[PDB]
Amino acid sequence: MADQVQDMYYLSPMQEGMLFHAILNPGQSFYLEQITMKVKGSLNIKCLEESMNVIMDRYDVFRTVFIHEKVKRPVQVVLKKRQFQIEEIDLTHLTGSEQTAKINEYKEQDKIRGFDLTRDIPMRAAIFKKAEESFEWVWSYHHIILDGWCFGIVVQDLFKVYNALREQKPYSLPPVKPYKDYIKWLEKQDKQASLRYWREYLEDFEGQTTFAEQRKKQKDGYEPKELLFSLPEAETKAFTELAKSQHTTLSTALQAVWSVLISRYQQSGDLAFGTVVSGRPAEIKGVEHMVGLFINVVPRRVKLSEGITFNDLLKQLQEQSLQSEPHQYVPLYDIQSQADQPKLIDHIIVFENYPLQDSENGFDMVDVHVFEKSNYDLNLMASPGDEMLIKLAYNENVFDEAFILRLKSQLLTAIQQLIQNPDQPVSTINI
Template sequence: MAKLSQIQLAALPLTLSNVDDLYPLSPMQEGMLFHSMFEQSNAYVNQICFEVKGLDVARFKQAWQSVIARHDVLRTGFVCTDKMNLQFVAKESAQDWQELDWQHSQLDKNAVINAAQADRERGFDFINDPGLTRLTLIKTGVSEHYLIWTNHHLLTDGWSTSAMMGEVLQAYKGITLPKSTVQYKDYIAYLEKQDAAGNLAYWEHETSKLTDPSYLTSVLSGAEETERYAKQHIQFDEAQTTYLTDFAKQNHVTVNTVIQGAWALLLSRYLNRDTVCFGATTSGRPTDMNGSNTCLGMFINTIPVITEIDPAQSLITWLQSIQNANVRSRESEFTPLYDIQKQAGQHLELNKEGLFDTLMVFENYPISEALQSEERHDTSFDVVHSEEETNYPVSVEVDIAALLKITLTYQSDKVSTPSASRLSEQLGSLVLAMVANQSAILSELSLVTSAQAESLQVQGFGDEFTPYLVGVETPIYLPNGDAPVLRPEQYQDVVSTLNQLAEQTPDAEAVTCDGLSYTFKELYERSSQLAYYLREQGVVAEQRVGVALERSRDLPVAFLAILKAGAVYVPMDLSYPEQRLAYMIKDSQMQHILVSDNRIAVR
């Protein structure tokens, strides 16, 4: 399948006598290799740490080696040529195994995790480390060990990793494994037979629904200068998991679809869009390829999930439409994401993130299940730590084994911890709100969590919190008017509050900055004058107006004036890079910007 001449083969930096096969990469492998090799990233270096008791070390090493010999993909490395990237299968590949004795040291589990992190940061040599796997066994007692398993995602997906561990434990128990009749190269051959043009035409139609890419990080801010991955966890209890599962069955959708719907709705609210896009991994195992369910390798692919949100549409009808769209997309799921994005880039302005910067992953075979089903009665394996990251700024991993668990992994230089915490809380709240409000329309589903709602009620915002308020040009309270009588679900707008304060305490200090201040009366008068000017300049209700002013006493005047004009203000920090400011202007479709100098004009 590599289609290389003898001269090209001889030029490869390989010992050809130890090469058993040579063939192209899958689309997912191409993307991972690019990020790993050319961006010098360890994002796809995965790791699992086990606490092991009662291990027969010699038997376990033999079992591991037997599984390596059984699957070509576990002896695979990668080489780049001028024309294409290739993967090669080594005839022989000894396991990279290290044993450490910590029995007489004071090192604990945290030291093991630190050692694992250091090992992970080593990465892999794609040519000289075929198999891209390292094992470190740390002896901490007579029959107690920690096992650090570091491997590269290029060769195995989550299902394959769990299946491989299951095979190792079967061999460890003395079970003779049958000869493998299907190898990963058979999957590569299957991919080459796909209708690439037809599949790409499908995705061209789907991406045409988008007017912009969906970059969640464009409305969030990071907290650190350097890239670091962190996690937020959402754990559902048994009752919540049961309610969600029953809800999905009753409405003929999957739990995956419900979680996807919640994430799409959350993106829609954050980005203020009716159509959003995020990535989702597919299992990639062809049902019409014999033996695909027993073959190890990197089968998964990432495809766009493009969702349209109509606030007036019923929740159930909308979820069913997402489910149907997912089924249709599976017919074209083998299309390389870079081809989809290259095509979409002809009508969309994309940055290096492509169509989206968030990814959703559904764990379909957790390694804990393999451990529970295959471990010997005299040997136990418990996962104490794991690392699995992607190059996306935000990843949402869904694990529904016994109980539903959602893990939000984020890059802290792009997303702050408070923002990530709020995202995870809102996602969990949305999922539960869907289950509790089956007859709701989409606009009735709120991002406000129960804790936030209780806090708002304490502050006097009514018995119920209305998530959406239709924008109005006229405040609830006008100067010299009657005091408003609020309904339980209403709360007084900020313009009305300041109007009242301008009457009740006109000379009281309202705003102060750098030794300068405005009274409530001055704030009222100046904001009213500016609001009148904005109207004269063509600002209309619901229009977005940029505010590119330095921090001063005039900044709240600008905000208040825009609200009085019935419009929406968009704060613009002049310290932002030009590209981000330009994106804000385009994304919000603002036609007016308040500035104090010409710095925006020259951009």
């Protein structure tokens, strides 16, 4: 009802693409993030639920629903108020194995259910009580309203409010600019110019099947496996110092190392891979604190000339990052149409924190597992820390475990060698 509506506005191109595929592929876990937290301690579910309702009121995207039927163009509608409820389930009368079964049953049905974006709050939570001070919290949300960085903001706020309610002390949260300001910014962007930026960037790129000689083609479907390792502290510090000394980021430096490795396997100096970009335009005041969907997967195309050094590559990538910033809102589908290559990239490199990791909150998160549908057969996911954390997540029906172990070995030695000689040709790095 109009009286219940706060606001209405169009979708970002990325949101619009997600709504389209979400509607067209119900039941397939598209765009669903499901986090399972094992919790030990005196979690107060009522307090957590009050905290979640402060978050609901604070960030318009949680009160947003989507309309696609009987309209010229989809719209997102912000409701003035929506009450969040945590589903509380008591499993204390079940055996351990029976508890695991009930929780896995919930998680599997949750993936299939997804969200009805025309009516549901695009976030939900179930908390299973397994014993006194023993819980599992399954937190689900849809990426059409929230990317990872924005999720981190929400987590921070949620636990700031929870802890103030627990300590029975006043609190405040700083003002936030609403997500509609990003939608307004998009209005001012020349969409054809952004398509042209990508068309020119990808001009004359010839396709690439990455690690073609290692790809198996036998077993059907995705068999998800992961290899986790850490870069030692000394190397992590030196790699971080190197990135900063070249006025770039850890993420760009990791992409640069990867480029060297890909160039060898592809026997080519023109290569591409997927990268996650923030999508937060600097000209938007306070964008870094907004909550919504900004982060995008875009192609990175790297060109290695004879003699190119690692510091040369850092400069190349850093400059391209800056040039791409106004155009990071373009969906990958539209980008890849500008190259006439629907499979232009076939793996991704992601550098990110996770705000939930395994005192203050009165309880411990003893385990955290994240489910997200996998769109590529290989994904390199790194996270900052005293030891940089690197995860190679892959489809074992395509890549052998032995090959992923070889990539780990090659990554580690390449990083070590490039730290030591960032001003020699990268062709001299032994892998």
